Design a binder for this molecule. Structure first.
Ligand SMILES: C[C@]1(Cc2cn(-c3ccc(F)cc3)nn2)NC(=O)CC1=O
Ligand SMILES: C[C@]1(Cc2cn(-c3ccc(F)cc3)nn2)NC(=O)CC1=O
Ligand SMILES: C[C@]1(Cc2cn(-c3ccc(F)cc3)nn2)NC(=O)CC1=O
Ligand SMILES: C[C@]1(Cc2cn(-c3ccc(F)cc3)nn2)NC(=O)CC1=O
Ligand SMILES: [Zn+2]
Ligand SMILES: [Zn+2]
Ligand SMILES: [Zn+2]
Ligand SMILES: [Zn+2]
Lengths: 197, 197
């Protein structure tokens, strides 16, 4: 009857958030983003993206770590796989590029849980937790993983981003604030048995 | 990198839906429902409910089996645990009481996956995928499980209910139609690798 995965959470105060050089997005606008997605689809087919959900707590209240681009969009750490790149090795690589330390000490990323899949049917913002009817060639597949943090860590945050710890209640039914993927993390995380260390 | 659970789906046409006597709810109204929840909480504490998600496909399109009370509310098969009753044995018992056969041949229910948890903080309709801030005594805890169906089965549907196969697209962002638990099943099922048999 204990069919739940057990996940260790640690206090937000256990983690050090340092700073490093800005990390710029490839796309300077929504229009460039969809143009590049069109160009690459014609060359290498469906875009494969991976995103990490990093959880902490304070006073036993779970929080998801989000990256805010200045004061604009909230994102999960992650991004685009290269062709033939393993999803888990790829998320580890991307989380090292985003939050990895300047002193080049390796973070020990632990990734043992897929928590969802989203599909983009067109070169357009809409994404669904399934392949919609009539769609044979989705343009992007996004895969979300739970990343188990160590007890303590130093994260180097690119200077153009803020690392925010968002409580689940703030995400819940807040698609306007966070969009349909981040806003459904409370439902996606509910199956986990969190230990508040 | 294959961190996904693999689930066998079978065509809706593999299953026979027979009929049996009506199965009446304990509560004749919302008001009686919340009155009984109040009375039992004072005697035995938090209500523990369990619900089964049964999935089929037709032409490779996943559908969730829902029970419609005539043409009114949609529900998952499940219900209330007795005090000290195991969650999995209890869901098996409840799914036998609801969909079990008149000839008394045993369904082989397979339950290996928790897919979420919902909490009711007050004697009121609102439910959340987490324990909200300030709430120490939640009045109900609802646990959802994925039920792996056999290749073929006969289900006896109480005559006062319709068994409907709902495609994921119909549930998605449809809280008004289905409420916050059923409407978030697409997100909760996205992590599964479905095999369309
Ligand atoms: C996928 C990637 C590279 C990149 C940017 N970020 C990032 C930074 C902060 C954050 F919260 C989430 C993602 N991670 N990787 N994106 C591009 O625009 C080019 C490219 O390949
Ligand atoms: C930031 C620092 C010094 C430092 C901090 N920590 C640490 C703290 C907390 C923790 F969890 C694990 C390590 N180690 N070294 N100075 C640099 O130039 C980079 C660098 O390393
Ligand atoms: C939990 C239960 C018994 C019961 C009713 N149903 C049911 C039928 C169809 C359906 F779709 C979902 C649930 N299952 N069990 N409910 C009561 O009102 C008394 C009681 O103990
Ligand atoms: C409904 C029926 C006859 C029947 C059908 N099946 C069957 C069909 C499909 C399947 F997947 C597994 C079994 N077996 N017996 N007559 C009664 O009085 C109850 C009863 O059993
Ligand atoms: Zn505390
Ligand atoms: Zn895909
Ligand atoms: Zn077919
Ligand atoms: Zn509880």
């Amino acid at each position: 009857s204990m069919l739940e995965r057990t996940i260790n959470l640690y206090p937000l105060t256990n983690y050090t958030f340092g700073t490093k050089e800005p990390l710029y997005e490839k796309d300077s606008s929504v229009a460039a983003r969809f143009q590049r997605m069109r160009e690459e689809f014609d060359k290498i087919g469906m875009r494969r993206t991976v995103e990490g959900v990093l959880i902490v707590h304070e006073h036993r209240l779970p929080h998801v770590l989000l990256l805010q681009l200045g004061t604009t969009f909230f994102k999960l750490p992650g991004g685009e796989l290269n062709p033939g790149e393993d999803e888990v090795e790829g998320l580890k690589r991307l989380m090292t590029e985003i939050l990895g330390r300047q002193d080049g000490v390796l973070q020990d990323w632990v990734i043992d849980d897929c928590i969802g899949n989203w599909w983009r049917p067109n070169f357009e913002p809409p994404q669904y937790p399934y392949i919609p009817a009539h769609i044979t060639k989705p343009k992007e597949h996004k895969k979300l993983f739970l990343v188990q943090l160590q007890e303590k860590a130093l994260f180097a945050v690119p200077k153009n981003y803020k690392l925010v710890a968002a409580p689940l209640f703030e995400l819940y039914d807040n698609a306007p604030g966070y969009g349909p993927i981040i806003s459904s993390l409370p439902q996606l995380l509910s199956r986990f048995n969190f230990i508040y260390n």
